[PDB]
Amino acid sequence: ETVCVTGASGFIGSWLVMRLLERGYTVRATVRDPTNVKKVKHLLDLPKAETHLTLWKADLADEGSFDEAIKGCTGVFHVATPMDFESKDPENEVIKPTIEGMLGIMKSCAAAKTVRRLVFTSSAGTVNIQEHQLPVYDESCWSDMEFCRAKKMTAWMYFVSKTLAEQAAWKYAKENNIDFITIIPTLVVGPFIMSSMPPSLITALSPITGNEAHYSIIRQGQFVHLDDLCNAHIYLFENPKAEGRYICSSHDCIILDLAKMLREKYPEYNIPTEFKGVDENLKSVCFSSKKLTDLGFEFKYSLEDMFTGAVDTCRAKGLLPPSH
Ligand SMILES: NC(=O)c1ccc[n+]([C@@H]2O[C@H](COP(=O)([O-])OP(=O)(O)OC[C@H]3O[C@@H](n4cnc5c(N)ncnc54)[C@H](OP(=O)(O)O)[C@@H]3O)[C@@H](O)[C@H]2O)c1
Numbered sequence: 001e002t003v004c005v006t007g008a009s010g011f012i013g014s015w016l017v018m019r020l021l022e023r024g025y026t027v028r029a030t031v032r033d034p035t036n037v038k039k040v041k042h043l044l045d046l047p048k049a050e051t052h053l054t055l056w057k058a059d060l061a062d063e064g065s066f067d068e069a070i071k072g073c074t075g076v077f078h079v080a081t082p083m084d085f086e087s088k089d090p091e092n093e094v095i096k097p098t099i100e101g102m103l104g105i106m107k108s109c110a111a112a113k114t115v116r117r118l119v120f121t122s123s124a125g126t127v128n129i130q131e132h133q134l135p136v137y138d139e140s141c142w143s144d145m146e147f148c149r150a151k152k153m154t155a156w157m158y159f160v161s162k163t164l165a166e167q168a169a170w171k172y173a174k175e176n177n178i179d180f181i182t183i184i185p186t187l188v189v190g191p192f193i194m195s196s197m198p199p200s201l202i203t204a205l206s207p208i209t210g211n212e213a214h215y216s217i218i219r220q221g222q223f224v225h226l227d228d229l230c231n232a233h234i235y236l237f238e239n240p241k242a243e244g245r246y247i248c249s250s251h252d253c254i255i256l257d258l259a260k261m262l263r264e265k266y267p268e269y270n271i272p273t274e275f276k277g278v279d280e281n282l283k284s285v286c287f288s289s290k291k292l293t294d295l296g297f298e299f300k301y302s303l304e305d306m307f308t309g310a311v312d313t314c315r316a317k318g319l320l321p322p323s324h
Pocket residue numbers: 007008009010011012013030031032033039058059060061078079080081082083097121122123124162184185186187188189198199200
């Protein structure tokens with residue numbers, strides 16, 4: 001059948017298109033700039049690209065820009081999003097286009113008449129951004145926007161855009177009887193086919209790079225393998241019993257435990273053994289994917305799989321040095 005993937009050039013977008021095409025789908029991939037070779041070459045290089053892949057130019061900031069790509073589609077994966085953590089105008093450059101793009105895409109599906117399910121890639125940032133951390137999160141849990149805006153931790157504007165966009169979308173979907181499903185990944189880690197540094201790998205490989213500003217997201221961290229996640233998107237689109245929100249997270253551990261694993265696998269890098277404000281007694285925080293596994297979904301990869309894939313790929317593409 002015929003599906004649209006928004007933001008197909010990116011980390012999740014491009015891997016999802018690959019798996020989709022492999023599964024026999026016809027894919028309509030959207031990008032902002034089709035002339036950018038670093039954004040599209042990895043898509044065009046996929047098997048079945050000549051026969052089963054089309055490219056479409058679209059930006060979330062433009063009203064109606066996804067109408068054409070979505071008309072005719074049986075399904076839509078809305079993966080595209082503005083990823084700047086360092087914007088001087090968050091409201092206009094990030095929050096507004098994330099929310100309005102989301103609702104625009106839902107309207108574009110409504111206009112199409114052909115789309116039987118819309119799947120949105122939400123964010124764990126919409127779940128556990130509050131001052132006190134519960135031991136385990138599920139799909140009933142939503143972030144505290146007052147706390148997020150006040151604290152301005154790393155990625156706050158991103159977390160706001162994703163939370164507000166999902167709540168807006170559920171409002172629209174309830175009021176228009178739209179078959180809408182959200183997937184809530186934690187930190188996505190693994191090998192990849194894009195040519196530049198995945199945004200989430202900035203965070204995930206911060207113990208190696210020393211990007212201490214990203215430690216706050218992995219201090220009590222949760223993880224999911226790129227391929228498991230992309231398989232979950234396909235699974236939830238296909239499973240007719242699917243409803244509501246779905247956490248997709250396979251592992252949780254504190255930064256201490258992550259860095260240990262990394263130190264052991266990669267002696268060549270300067271990975272710390274101690275982190276400011278972090279103790280061996282710090283609670284690990286779990287995102288429970290029980291709702292997802294209860295449907296019958298199975299995770300297949302380990303934390304070690306994720307990080308080895310990540311680092312090995314980064315090296316191959318000259319995004320990480322061979323050693324320090
Ligand atoms: N990776 C993770 O750990 C993680 C965790 C939870 C949720 N997510 C969610 O997963 C989705 C994809 O994340 P990702 O890691 O794959 O990030 P990514 O590599 O940055 O992919 C995002 C894509 O969005 C596109 N984009 C940016 N601004 C746009 C705009 N204004 N209009 C249309 N497209 C725009 C970009 O493609 P072009 O430049 O070609 O237009 C980019 O390739 C996002 O919805 C994100 O919130 C990711």
